[PDB]
Amino acid sequence: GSSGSSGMSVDAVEIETLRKTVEDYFCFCYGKALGKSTVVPVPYEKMLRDQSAVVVQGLPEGVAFKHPENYDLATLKWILENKAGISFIIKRPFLEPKKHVGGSGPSSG
């Protein structure tokens, strides 16, 4: 058995929860500008190499569009604060093959 079991900080669940909120947002702005009825996952890996297909506005100073995990807890809060303003401009959809029709009806469980 364990003697001095050391869990995780209580505030930790915060810094982690914040990164998630920002992660989704980027998806909302991206999918929203596309004109779809659902959120789309922003391909950071791709956007990183090619920052033209989709632009990002409403960002702070001395910053650079990147994963919401690379930003310090401090910065993270900012994004969420001035998020309502953050916008996304789609210049062109990345190059990728479409997916064949399979099963409709997205659910959780």
Distances (CA, A) of 101 to 3, 18, 57, 98, 105: 54, 35, 34, 10, 12
Domain carrying residue 37: 1-109
Number of structural domains in the chain: 1
C-alpha–C-alpha distance, residues 53 and 95, integer Å: 10
Write down the residue that tokens 């650079």 correspond to.
64
CATH of the domain at 59: 3.90.1460.10
The distance from CA 9 to its chain's CA centroid, rounded to whole angstroms, is 24
DSSP-based three-state secondary structure for 99:
coil
* Experimental method reported for this structure: NMR
The DSSP letter of residue 82 is T
Nearest to 15 by CA among 74, 98, 55, 59: 74
DSSP-based three-state secondary structure for 37:
coil
Write down the residue that tokens 């099963």 correspond to.
103
Q: Are 91 and 52 in contact (CB under 8 A)?
A: yes
